[PDB]
Design a protein around this ligand. Structure first.
Ligand SMILES: *[C@@H]1O[C@H](CO)[C@@H](O[C@@H]2O[C@H](CO)[C@@H](O[C@@H]3O[C@H](CO[C@H]4O[C@H](CO[C@H]5O[C@H](CO)[C@@H](O)[C@H](O)[C@@H]5O[C@H]5O[C@H](CO)[C@@H](O)[C@H](O)[C@@H]5O)[C@@H](O)[C@H](O[C@H]5O[C@H](CO)[C@@H](O)[C@H](O)[C@@H]5O[C@H]5O[C@H](CO)[C@@H](O)[C@H](O)[C@@H]5O)[C@@H]4O)[C@@H](O)[C@H](O[C@H]4O[C@H](CO)[C@@H](O)[C@H](O)[C@@H]4O[C@H]4O[C@H](CO)[C@@H](O)[C@H](O)[C@@H]4O)[C@@H]3O)[C@H](O)[C@H]2NC(C)=O)[C@H](O)[C@H]1NC(C)=O
Ligand SMILES: *[C@@H]1O[C@H](CO)[C@@H](O[C@@H]2O[C@H](CO)[C@@H](O[C@@H]3O[C@H](CO[C@H]4O[C@H](CO[C@H]5O[C@H](CO)[C@@H](O)[C@H](O)[C@@H]5O[C@H]5O[C@H](CO)[C@@H](O)[C@H](O)[C@@H]5O)[C@@H](O)[C@H](O[C@H]5O[C@H](CO)[C@@H](O)[C@H](O)[C@@H]5O[C@H]5O[C@H](CO)[C@@H](O)[C@H](O)[C@@H]5O)[C@@H]4O)[C@@H](O)[C@H](O[C@H]4O[C@H](CO)[C@@H](O)[C@H](O)[C@@H]4O[C@H]4O[C@H](CO)[C@@H](O)[C@H](O)[C@@H]4O)[C@@H]3O)[C@H](O)[C@H]2NC(C)=O)[C@H](O)[C@H]1NC(C)=O
Ligand SMILES: *[C@@H]1O[C@H](CO)[C@@H](O[C@@H]2O[C@H](CO)[C@@H](O[C@@H]3O[C@H](CO[C@H]4O[C@H](CO)[C@@H](O)[C@H](O)[C@@H]4O)[C@@H](O)[C@H](O[C@H]4O[C@H](CO)[C@@H](O)[C@H](O)[C@@H]4O[C@H]4O[C@H](CO)[C@@H](O)[C@H](O)[C@@H]4O[C@H]4O[C@H](CO)[C@@H](O)[C@H](O)[C@@H]4O)[C@@H]3O)[C@H](O)[C@H]2NC(C)=O)[C@H](O)[C@H]1NC(C)=O
Ligand SMILES: *[C@@H]1O[C@H](CO)[C@@H](O[C@@H]2O[C@H](CO)[C@@H](O[C@@H]3O[C@H](CO[C@H]4O[C@H](CO)[C@@H](O)[C@H](O)[C@@H]4O)[C@@H](O)[C@H](O)[C@@H]3O)[C@H](O)[C@H]2NC(C)=O)[C@H](O)[C@H]1NC(C)=O
Ligand SMILES: *[C@@H]1O[C@H](CO)[C@@H](O)[C@H](O)[C@H]1NC(C)=O
Ligand code: NA
Ligand code: NA
Lengths: 832, 834
């Protein structure tokens, strides 16, 4: 069985780079704390005990309010009067650094104004190993360079607005199946531990880890570790991924929290790099914790060094001060668990004062504008046989497909979006927000047609083919809407347990499009979906005149789409994944059956880096629509490629901050009423063992503490660490590349030039994306696009050196409009 | 068994009043025609033989195009690029003569532009005897005065636009059950003849006939006779309703067409006063006709006098010239039967040249504006506890109910509107048109909220009550949409065979409303329906803060409603019928079982005039909302009632004329150069053998015994005491009393008042009050105006069966003026007038 080697001690923060000031302030405040106050920072107060999906008790004597952590990566979850933004996959489709940023900002502002201190997003894990993985749509793209950039921009947006962002899920949680034992049992499978992602060192550095190096370097304050194991060690106590990869090599200065139910030990996790336990209990409302009381005790009894808990508290405080959250603090002014104005202050046991729990704060501002725009700028025009844009003069418009219309239960009428009814604008699970409203395609397209005095109708029953066929024969244009949905594993829709059972359109989508196209010579297909779908049965139908994929556009869906169809917005989006002929063409199959008895199922990432386009190119398969493909209402020309060659070894000792006293200092204070199921830092009595309640307390302790886990002496700095996102020399710019880009068509719009390299050698992908931008050009206008290649951009990870190395194989650079349309290419000069 | 007494001969046209010129022109052309050409004018060509739901072959030698007759009373049926107007019952709710006229004008422009010569509407039959009758919504109100005025204004708008209007269904077709034999057999009922409406002579004159007198007087070109019998004689060969009441008494100068499949004899119908056979065959596509060839023969063999057939042709041509159809003539430029651009000229058999059958002519102009305005002005505010208008500042709006949402099959996705899915904007059967689009309440209300940056959702599944209650608890206002549908008898939705099985909200509507009201303290109910519904379980709920009835509003439904809810339009509409506590409170039960063995079911109208509010008042029952009830966003005051007495005809007809000549049987044999299209109905004979050309098993059997006395009498006739003018003796229209009252807007917002003038005619078997006059008046805050109207001799009379005339009885009469049939604060005794 795959094995995860140890890396100890857990590196301590050191004020690195842009962290120096936040770090000095965190040290100054943590220095004043008692041990039980530190422990309060590291541990949630129990599932649904307070307002937010995760919440710590804070440090009231020092005026630090409890930290409120709230889903989702696309808008506030479980709340009211908030916006519902387009999914991460749509931000990937925009290929637009500035939009990613502005979406981050607009979400940070909403969260901040609810009294939320930490946003649980954005996501870049799952990266997207498998096209049918249930949560890829929360993240960005199976491409690491595209994902890493947009992930970093999103983070900076949220954090510049004064909310800690949480880069999640770290790492390799690439499928929903078997991700949690209790979940897998509810679906009929008996496993003793969760799915183990088993991945080699080179692949993890070149693909899954790379967007997290970008997040760290961009200054992300939190990381959320994952439910899966990596080589049979749990994500939230994996010393290799946490202490070595994230903290020693990438130099992360912030804090690591567990996923909810992903904390599996007290001492083991603390020593392997975890900093925060969420939601704080061992199972939801168990009234027990692996930390809380247990972490106070582990420090009192000598097993967890004081320097390790000090370091947790300094990381947590430093991320809070880094975004300036102290200056924007207010208790959460809503409840995730009820919409009532009044309620008991502690929801789960219904205890504490009966008081106001929701203030109905409308934090939407004018955010509907960025959502509408982002929706339009993420709508990929995959095919257009001169059918779009529409003019508004079409005499009779047939809107066809349940995906055009309303969810009959209301836009929020499925808990956590857990259905596929009506237009698909948000997929399902925790990566969700309550819509303030939802503009459907039916609404916006019929309003547009009426403004021109046209005739128009929507048929929204996908088995009503007789009515579809009759109307399509009468119509000047048929706009056919289809979808494919997926979501987090705890919800099953039509037997899709989170992951998609297939890549085929839901609700009779293929047959609907064939019924329309059999009867109407101007059939235009609009897809809303979490990822790619199979189009092979109808994409090349002679009456199918255009095809668009619009992802998961959030609240302004119909308007984002009408802006594109009627030419208010010239589509610039490009596909952020591959559209293959068959599911087999993508390989990377999900693990769907037990393969290790009743132990943890083993998910070997045996393809290595060869996922999505890298896998199609390696198998010489031709996609229907390649990664990077999207059309425009204008045309662009790329020409004139020019290339130009451009001109600490040890840590400190681990510090301790403040002092630890006797057990008796940490016994529950006498005047305090203990709320049921609430997790506290205190001890029932000075008897450690009886106050822990742990059946293993004090047994074999030293043989269960890996070697070096309590070593607070100076440590070596790794060859590939010593910076933020890795050694600074990785970011030296070595080669400058330029091209001329001209709009040669008749409509202003955006080009997305893409620069790929070929690093060379028998095991390397033929091409890999490195740079891109999205550039606005009026008709006939030209611009020079210039970009640089870093040392990292030209390197491979060398497992023998434990470092990035520029290999001796000759390298090439390619520039064009997609991963398959690269008319400009050159040999790169040798650089090192 | 009820018996219908004979009345013969069938009165001939005479150029009465405003028909002088059209009759002279009709005479001049019919005088030039051959027998088979005259026959062509009277008989349709066969079910789906040509473009229109009914179509005659015309007179091509004289350049007279075939007459294209097309449904419906609310918009062109079976066509394309036309509008869908609100139903006639919304017109009633507006109480607005001007909107009734403008609706008729916009419909007539559309019909004319499609090359249609005759619109098959409007409808004042069914008047509305039973609140559950399947077609009352096509008409206006169970009140004759309200219906008659709006019927007449509708016909004038249509005719002034150059299209013949058809006042239908004449008469007493008050329910759908048992209306047609083969239809009843499809529902499992074996009957040998159609339901017989049996009604006394006073009742028919005071109620059902009265809007037909207004139609005739307003110059209606055509009348369509009905499927039912009246006292066991079929509507389309009832000499008493046709010869006596319509043609002799009301003085009708135009033509009577059959309902489709309501023609039941050749000789008997022609002599009893039918003028046109639709769709022209005996049963659809039977390639046999009671007229056509049979009528040509019936004249050749001496059974039907030439003067009768000539009078048919003259009535049909006079109606055509009276509206100026000859100046607008074009063949119909669409087909009712396919939407294809090209097809065979003769649809049913797929024969004749292969050519253009559809030109896709966009006839809508800007008619969406009148539709939108009329929907708003027909929205009755029944309850408002200071909940409406909405301001736009509501923070979270819950739109609740399937009736707010789209039909998942598309707005036209149920053939002839034969389902109740999504928002109910049009009821079912032939009284329908294809929507060009349909704006739902969901669309219009969500757009309004988003304009204000509010939050808003629609839940459109009526059994998703868990989602409904959760949202309602979070809402600032809950707008709950409910409906009740019905339609023509040939369609059954959920076991409702045209007529409604009950007056209860469909699709779980009472449970929806209670699930919302149990949870929002600001629940507003919007009803779309064909007629009244039972509101007793929730109307008085403390959390139901407003209730509106919006009828069947046609294509702008959701915008019409938003106009009212957000106060762009102050609702002025008034209930055109009563909202009772129970179904029993209305009495007048439908006949739903065979009550005459396998013979014609018998429908005795034994309540006499006491239908709708007249029945509630007779029984001293309190409606929830009475006839004439509607609220406003302002208040009005009535004062200063005053009454002022004012200072206020051949006795024989001419002999029946003949125009042109009839020749030998050999003049009328099939022309030799002509391909006879299958199923097509022709006026021609196979051979000079009359008997064998007719193919009638009863040809020449006991002929004289089956020709009623007087039936061939072409000599001068007495003018009836109640006849001699248009819609009856012109003395009935003398104005005898002027009434005036001052109406003031005493509130803070402009609005329309609908003053209502009722009379009490006195006497032990008379309704306590009956409506006579009304108008709709726009007043600014504080503004006053003097509303002045006049009572005519007719208005003050009762029908005296012994005199056969209208009489002002000697019981003392009273005038009452106010805002509804129960809110009448002003009263005045009337002085004796005669
Ligand atoms: C001061 O106060 C403190 C606070 O109160 C007191 O703290 C307690 O100290 C105890 C020891 O005194 C702790 O109890 C022991 O816990 C260990 C660790 O369990 C966790 O980690 C397991 C993985 O461990 C590896 O990795 C972690 C880091 O991730 C390392 O820290 C470990 O050292 C170990 O490292 C090796 O492997 C990695 C690669 O993976 C390498 O990189 C390293 O180089 C090393 O080679 C993990 O598997 C555990 O998972 C179990 O528990 C989860 C529930 O928490 C559950 O979800 C999992 O499914 C799994 O369940 C199964 O196991 C448990 C028992 O643990 C059963 O209850 C359950 O029913 C299932 O069977 C977990 O996350 C733990 O391994 C120890 O248990 C082993 O040893 C005891 C005997 O000593 C046996 O009785 C057990 O059966 C068990 O035996 C297995 O392991 C043996 C190898 O070790 C093997 O020989 C056996 O054959 C068998 O396979 C103890 O439970 C306690 O956690 C801690 N409490 C708190 C609150 O922190 C403290 O004692 C006090 N100090 C003083 C001085 O008084
Ligand atoms: C020149 O050319 C012409 C063109 O070809 C030739 O025209 C043909 O003339 C024939 C006579 O020679 C016609 O045949 C006869 O028709 C009659 C009328 O039938 C229709 O009207 C019925 C109601 O009648 C009353 O009202 C009408 C006006 O509405 C009057 O015109 C009648 O005079 C009669 O008036 C009385 O009552 C009213 C009140 O209702 C009073 O106000 C008046 O004061 C009078 O009192 C009606 O009921 C008929 O309906 C039947 O047929 C429909 C299909 O058309 C169907 O939908 C109905 O359900 C119903 O079906 C039942 O009856 C028919 C037969 O008629 C059966 O086939 C069927 O299976 C059902 O049983 C219709 O709408 C008709 O009454 C005559 O038939 C009676 O008498 C014959 C024998 O003489 C019997 O064999 C019949 O069974 C029937 O008997 C009933 O009535 C008797 C009283 O007379 C009674 O004694 C019996 O007990 C019995 O129950 C004839 O069929 C033929 O219609 C006509 N063709 C065309 C195309 O116009 C003409 O001949 C030729 N000239 C010459 C010289 O050659
Ligand atoms: C880890 O995080 C957790 C979670 O955040 C932290 O736990 C929280 O800690 C808070 C203390 O920081 C503790 O707060 C207490 O709340 C009690 C309930 O307050 C609510 O109800 C009251 C009463 O109806 C309302 O007034 C109030 O506004 C709230 O709605 C308060 O009652 C406590 O107030 C007392 O202590 C504070 C100072 O902390 C005084 O200012 C206040 O006047 C009260 O003082 C009296 O009681 C204290 C002892 O508790 C005495 O020392 C003092 O002399 C006063 O004594 C008189 O009155 C008491 C009875 O009132 C009487 O018996 C005596 O004889 C005298 O007459 C305080 O506000 C939260 O409850 C707690 N949360 C939970 C879920 O447990 C935890 O501290 C963190 N740990 C660390 C190490 O940082
Ligand atoms: C009663 O109404 C009936 C229905 O309107 C009348 O029947 C129609 O009478 C007309 C006028 O006489 C006939 O017209 C003829 O049609 C043929 C065929 O026309 C088409 O084909 C040719 C060649 O490809 C094409 O060139 C034409 O433009 C047409 O497209 C012509 O060839 C003749 O010259 C003549 O126009 C109709 O055919 C006929 N219709 C039917 C359904 O039978 C009937 O005349 C009326 N009777 C009375 C007494 O007035
Ligand atoms: C008249 O002639 C046609 C063609 O021969 C024949 O089909 C039809 O049956 C005849 N009509 C009658 C009443 O015989
Ligand atoms: Na086809
Ligand atoms: Na209640």
């Amino acid at each position: 069985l795959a094995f995860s080697p140890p890396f100890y001690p857990s590196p301590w923060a050191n004020g690195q780079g842009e962290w120096a000031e936040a770090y000095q302030r965190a040290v100054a405040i943590v220095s004043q704390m008692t041990l039980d106050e530190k422990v309060n920072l590291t541990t949630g107060t129990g599932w649904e005990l307070e307002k937010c999906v995760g919440q710590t008790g804070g440090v009231p004597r020092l005026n630090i309010g409890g930290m409120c952590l709230q889903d989702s990566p696309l808008g506030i979850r479980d709340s009211d009067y908030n916006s519902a933004f387009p999914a991460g996959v749509n931000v990937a489709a925009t290929w637009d650094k500035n939009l990613a940023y502005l979406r981050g900002q607009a979400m940070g502002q909403e969260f901040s104004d609810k009294g939320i201190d930490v946003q649980l997003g954005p996501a870049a894990g799952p990266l997207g190993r498998s096209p049918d993985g249930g949560r890829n749509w929360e993240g960005f793209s199976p491409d690491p360079a595209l994902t890493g950039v947009l992930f970093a921009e999103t983070i900076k947006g949220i954090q510049d607005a004064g909310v800690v962002a949480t880069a999640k899920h770290y790492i390799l949680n690439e499928q929903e199946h078997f991700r949690q034992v209790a979940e897998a049992a509810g679906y009929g499978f008996n496993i003793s531990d969760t799915i183990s992602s088993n991945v080699d060192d080179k692949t993890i550095h070149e693909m899954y880890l790379w967007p997290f190096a970008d997040a760290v370097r961009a200054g992300v304050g939190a990381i959320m570790c994952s439910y899966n194991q990596i080589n049979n060690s749990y994500g939230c106590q994996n010393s290799y991924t946490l202490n070595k990869l994230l903290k020693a090599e990438l130099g992360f200065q912030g804090f690591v929290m567990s996923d909810w139910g992903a904390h599996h030990s007290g001492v083991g996790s603390a020593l392997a790099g975890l900093d925060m336990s969420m939601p704080g209990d061992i199972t939801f409302d168990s009234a027990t914790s692996f930390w809380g009381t247990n972490l106070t005790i582990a420090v009192l009894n000598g097993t967890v060094p004081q320097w390790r808990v000090d370091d947790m508290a300094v990381r947590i405080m430093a991320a809070y001060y880094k975004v300036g959250r102290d200056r924007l603090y207010q208790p959460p002014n809503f409840s995730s668990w009820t919409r009532d104005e009044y309620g008991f202050k502690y929801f789960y046991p219904q205890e504490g004062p009966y008081e106001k729990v929701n203030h109905f704060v409308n934090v939407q501002r004018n955010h509907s504008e960025v959502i509408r725009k982002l929706g339009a700028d993420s709508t990929v025009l995959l095919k257009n046989n001169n059918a779009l844009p529409l003019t508004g003069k079409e005499r009779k418009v047939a809107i066809l497909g349940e995906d055009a219309g309303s969810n009959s239960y209301g836009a929020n009428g499925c808990s956590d979006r857990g259905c596929d009814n009506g237009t698909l604008a948000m997929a399902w699970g925790s990566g969700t927000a309550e819509f303030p409203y939802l503009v459907t395609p039916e609404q916006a397209i019929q309003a547009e047609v009426l403004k021109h005095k046209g005739s128009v109708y929507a048929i929204t029953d996908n088995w009503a083919l007789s009515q579809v066929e009759t109307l399509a024969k009468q119509a000047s244009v048929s706009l056919v809407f289809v979808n494919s949905d997926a979501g987090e594993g705890y919800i099953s829709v039509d037997g899709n347990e989170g992951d998609r059972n297939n890549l085929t359109l839901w609700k009779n989508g293929d047959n609907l499009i064939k019924a329309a196209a059999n009867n109407c010579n101007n059939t235009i297909v609009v897809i809303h979906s979490v990822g790619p779908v199979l189009v092979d049965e109808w994409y090349d139908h002679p009456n199918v005149t255009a095809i668009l994929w619009a992802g998961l556009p959030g609240q302004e869906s119909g308007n984002s789409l009408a802006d594109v169809l009627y030419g208010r917005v010239n589509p610039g989006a490009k596909s952020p994944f591959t559209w293959g002929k068959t599911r087999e063409a993508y390989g990377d199959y999900l693990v769907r059956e037990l393969n290790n008895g009743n132990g943890a199922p083993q998910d070997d990432f045996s393809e290595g880096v060869f996922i999505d386009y890298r896998g199609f190119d390696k198998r010489n398969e031709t996609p229907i629509y390649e990664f990077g493909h999207g059309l425009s209402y204008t045309t662009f020309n790329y020409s004139g490629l020019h290339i130009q060659v451009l001109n600490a070894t040890e840590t400190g000792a681990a510090p301790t901050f403040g002092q630890v006293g006797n057990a008796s200092d940490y016994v529950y204070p006498e005047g305090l009423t203990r709320i049921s199921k609430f997790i506290y830092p205190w001890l029932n009595s000075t008897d450690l063992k009886a106050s822990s309640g742990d059946p293993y307390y004090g047994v074999d302790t030293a043989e269960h503490v890996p070697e070096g886990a309590t070593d607070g002496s100076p440590q070596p700095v790794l060859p590939a660490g010593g910076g933020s996102g890795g050694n600074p020399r990785l970011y030296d710019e070595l080669i400058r590349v330029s091209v001329t880009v001209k709009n040669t068509g008749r409509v202003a719009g955006d080009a997305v030039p893409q620069l790929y390299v070929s690093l060379g050698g028998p095991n390397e992908p033929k091409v890999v994306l490195r740079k891109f931008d999205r550039l606005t050009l009026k008709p006939s206008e030209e611009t020079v696009w210039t970009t640089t290649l870093t040392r990292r951009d030209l390197s491979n990870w060398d497992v023998a050196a434990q470092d990035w190395v520029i290999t001796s194989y000759p390298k090439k650079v390619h520039v064009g409009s997609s991963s398959r349309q690269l008319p400009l290419h050159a040999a790169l000069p040798k650089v090192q």
